[PDB]
Amino acid sequence: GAGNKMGFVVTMLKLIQKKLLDKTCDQVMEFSWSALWNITDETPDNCEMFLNFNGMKLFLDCLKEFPEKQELHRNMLGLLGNVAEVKELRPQLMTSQFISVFSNLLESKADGIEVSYNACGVLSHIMFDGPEAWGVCEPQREEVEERMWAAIQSWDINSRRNINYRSFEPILRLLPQGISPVSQHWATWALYNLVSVYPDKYCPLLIKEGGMPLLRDIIKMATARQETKEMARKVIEHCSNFKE
Amino acid sequence: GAGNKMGFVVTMLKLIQKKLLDKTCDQVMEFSWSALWNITDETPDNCEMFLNFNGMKLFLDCLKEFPEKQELHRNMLGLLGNVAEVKELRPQLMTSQFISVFSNLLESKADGIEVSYNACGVLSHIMFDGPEAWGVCEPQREEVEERMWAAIQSWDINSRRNINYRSFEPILRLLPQGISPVSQHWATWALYNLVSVYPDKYCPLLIKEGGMPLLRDIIKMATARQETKEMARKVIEHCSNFKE
Incomplete structure (x- = not known):
């Protein structure tokens, strides 16, 4: 149960605006965006607000x-990652300004x-909707696609992380599809990084939510790139090693 | 996804403590408890923190x-209502001090x-665990039971409400059981009040989450008090009228 969630979002946005007009990104500014990131976790109505x-x-x-405020950018993009998980809200993100x-x-x-x-992750949920949803001229979808592949391949798979998941459902929904191979690749990478570095936390969550048959389905899929199948197999092995 | 939820809870509790030492219950004090109520909605790890x-x-x-601060009490007890939904946390509430x-x-x-x-609602989830869980001498379980029946019957069923639900699952779990008839009664009253006053919001939620067969099961149940069956039938009728 909850009270007035609208007042919570508005209070945070008013705090952010005041710090903006003060030209001050301090711990209060960062906390306000972190609070929005946290309260939008699996909570679409807060994303809409x-x-x-x-x-x-x-x-x-x-x-x-x-x-140059790195933690600020992390918190803001974590919030937008939550917004991007809500299909009804993604059209609001399809502007040349936002996509760029x-x-x-x-x-x-x-x-x-x-x-x-x-x-x-934001772009992975956007591209999951297909080329029909891409109504933006600048940049072109295929350019962003290539930038996504290059980003994913650039990340250390053993990276320690400043993000927490209570469910993998939004990520798992990117696996059983051939609309957007890059989105499936990002999702598979996300699982691979997290079970590799934090197996005690994320192997039981992935197992409980049905990730194993979804990843084996990827290995049997034609639209799946070879690099995605290789990672999917490693996630299965890591989770199997954990179960033993 | 989310960031450091622990820092959010701690920041709120530190704000509350400062307002306590200032002996000031203003909008900031109330907001901090409202924030805790909101962030614990269907979020057991925040309840545990x-x-x-x-x-x-x-x-x-x-x-x-x-x-005498009424909104403060509402927010605090809303937060505790969320805590009480987490079975692993309810033993922490079983003290003479807390139960009283x-x-x-x-x-x-x-x-x-x-x-x-x-x-x-807090006591309904506590009593759902059965007499074995009641390790408190003062007050006795049956005294609290009677106070719960009297409370529920005292409330106007057409009351406008300062609470929001995103799911009825914790309330529905109180329906298919004969351990605690009063808990089943509170849950049935909760649904009846909300579909009566806010049918546009809560009839589709109750229907989608399977409330109708659960309420019909109550009508066929022997351990269910007659007043509970009467309310359950009215919820079904209200939801059926809404579907038509």
Whole structure:
């Protein structure tokens, strides 16, 4: 149960706006975006409120004013990763302005890999909707696709992470599809990194939520790139080693 | 996905403690408890962190220092309602001190019915675990039971509400059981109030989550009190009228 979730989102956005006008990205600014990231975890109605309360404007403003604040970018892109999981909200992200930001951030080195990873996750859910959903002229879909492949291959698979998942369902939904091989690749990489580095936390979660048959299905899939099948097999092996 | 949820809980508890030492229950104090209520919605790990960070001490302190602050009590008991849904955490609530607080609050008139309702929900999940779980001498289980029946029957079924549900699953789990008839009664009342006053929001949620067969099962149940079956039938009728 809950109270007024709308007042919570608005209070955070008002705090962010005040810190923007103060031109100050301190622990309070970072906390407010972290709070939004946290409260949008598997909570689509909070994602919708962030957009409906002009949150994207504050996102863009903060990117412009604080281009070197790495933790800020991590928190903002974590929030947008949650927004991007809600299919009904993804059309709001399909603007040349927003897509260029997400594509540019694929090359971010901020907070290790977290900004690049979170931007790749946003784009993975966007590309899952197919070329019909891509109504943007700049950049072109296939350019962003290549930037996504290059981003994923650039990340250390043994990276320690500043992100937590309570469920893999949004990531698992990217596996049984041939619409967007790059989205399936990002999802498979996400699972592989997390079971490799944090098996005690994430192997039982992946097993309980049915990840194993989905990954074996990838290995038998024609539209799946060879690199995706290789990673899927390694996730199965890691999870099997954990079960033993 | 999410970031550091632990820092969020701790920051709220630190804000609450500072307002306690200032002896000030203002909008900031109320917001901090509302934030905890909101972030514990269907989120057991946040409930566990609240308890592990000495949250119950702050709860008791605030009840003592601010006995007439109605919105504060609503928010605090909403948070505890979320904690009480987590079976692994309910043993922490089984102390004479805590049970007496929840039982006393059944007669609260604060914020309409919200404090009484939230305290009754806490006790409904506690009593769902059976008499074996009741290790408290004062008060006795059957006294609290009677206070719960009297509370539920005192509430206007047409009450407007200051609570939101994103799922009825914790309430529905109280229906198919004969361990605690009063818990089943509270759960049935909760559904009846919400489909009566907010059918556009809650009839589709109850229907989608399988509430109808559960309520019909109650009508066929021997351990179910007649008043519970009457309410269950009315919920079915309201939901059927809505479907038509």
